[PDB]
Subunit: 197 residues, 3 copies
């Protein structure tokens, strides 16, 4: 509720980017208590949907799902300041995020190549914002639509956080070594170098 009202205030205000203003087109009641769809806009084009769960605490923690990205706008949106502002905004209201990566070719390619989720273009954006636990879902559309998502979470403790980063170091070490293309290696090196501060 406190959370509900501040998601609406920011969104109804609009989020400013160099790609256009991101606006709430329409809000929608979900399956459950505390669950809403927010249909978003970028400069008068449809952008994407946010599936929001506000929390029913001890039982269910809050989460956002970012999906339904307008393929006409994939090349405007991915790697943009609009996307940064979006994830920043959601970062301040959610400890768990799912982003659909299907329309994001760079992240797609990097995951297919074995890049750790946190060090993929999209994963890395979430990493910068404090999400430290990563799961890559790659289920065939064909079987079930909507199963190419990164799930990311903030560490519960300074202990879980340390464990998440130790695993990331291992995963990175395994990638170097498996990787055959020096350009992909340099890009992953430089994301990992960021983290190391």
């Amino acid at each position: 509720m406190v959370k509900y009202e501040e998601l609406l205030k920011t969104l109804e205000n609009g989020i400013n980017s160099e790609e256009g203003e991101i606006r709430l087109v329409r809000k929608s009641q979900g399956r459950f208590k505390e669950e809403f769809n927010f249909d978003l806009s970028l400069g008068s084009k449809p952008l994407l949907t946010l599936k929001v769960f506000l929390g029913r605490k001890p039982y269910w923690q809050p989460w956002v799902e970012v999906f339904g990205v307008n393929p006409n706008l994939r090349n405007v949106f991915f790697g943009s300041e609009a996307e940064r502002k979006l994830y920043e905004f959601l970062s301040e209201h959610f400890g768990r995020i799912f982003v659909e990566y299907f329309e994001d070719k760079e992240t797609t390619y990097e995951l297919q190549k074995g890049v750790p989720p946190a060090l993929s273009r999209l994963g890395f954006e979430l990493l910068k914002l404090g999400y430290t636990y990563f799961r890559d879902w790659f289920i065939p559309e064909g079987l079930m639509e909507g199963g190419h998502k990164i799930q990311a979470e903030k560490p519960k403790t300074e202990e879980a956080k340390k464990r998440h980063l130790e695993n990331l170091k291992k995963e990175f070490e395994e990638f170097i070594g498996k990787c055959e293309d020096e350009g992909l290696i340099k890009k992953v090196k430089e994301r990992y170098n960021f983290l190391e501060h």
Copy 2:
């Protein structure tokens, strides 16, 4: 194979101290034997039943209990209208699915490592002869409707024996909190 028997019981509703349960809508699902029964507690919509009537060498009957109105959670989960509905489904379906998301007790127990059969909701299913349990806990961010218990009647007296040996083992692999005494009193069968 019998809706008709399911239909006769459903309009001209179901008893219960929390209000009557009655039919509202009714459709034809993806497959010839699949249907959706919309239900009410009083005038409020309650819940949806997805029934599958069987195609019996190939597919066995099952009912799914989902789409439960959040304004009734605290009234329905725990209630005798819940039991009267299960009780009634237990007479017609050897396999049942119930979404436990709105059920804050079942949820909290499952998350504690309680075996599905000894959780609030699952225990209610154990009474009615369901002996095989599966807890599905799939993030809604991935896929909607993946928080459900799957419960199954034994095909055979020997299948029952086996499911009950698994339950004893899950009971023990759990006492390895204070709600322990709650699970303990549930297993005393």
Copy 3:
């Protein structure tokens, strides 16, 4: 290109595929969630037949795939095993390296899979096998959990040698199945399908 493929699909589906069961036609198209994704509603004669979810490809990122699902329940005993079903898959195999076929309404395949026949030597999967598909998966996810989880998933192999290796494996599975089964009628059927494969 996703567009050449697209245009080839419409042309032969709108011309129609002739069968003794009737002409299979494309009667409706809708854009899916991704740009190269469509639902192609198909009729048999004048009755709805099924839906093809087509994914045209966005190579190298995503390979093309076709999902055949939503078989008209009152056409199941007409479609499965027909010349129509064969001519449909045959068309699909000329355009997609990966296929998904919903087997829920196909009781023979359902029955065979349950008795542990390898997916490739079931009635449905064998039909895909004959067309070049070599990697097989049997999905059997309960419908009360998630609609759409009784599918065969099959893929064309990348090379002739990978193709030779998965077939050796199908053989082990076949011989493993054939000495683990009663129902000599099933065994006779699976054996025919396997002898053919040479």
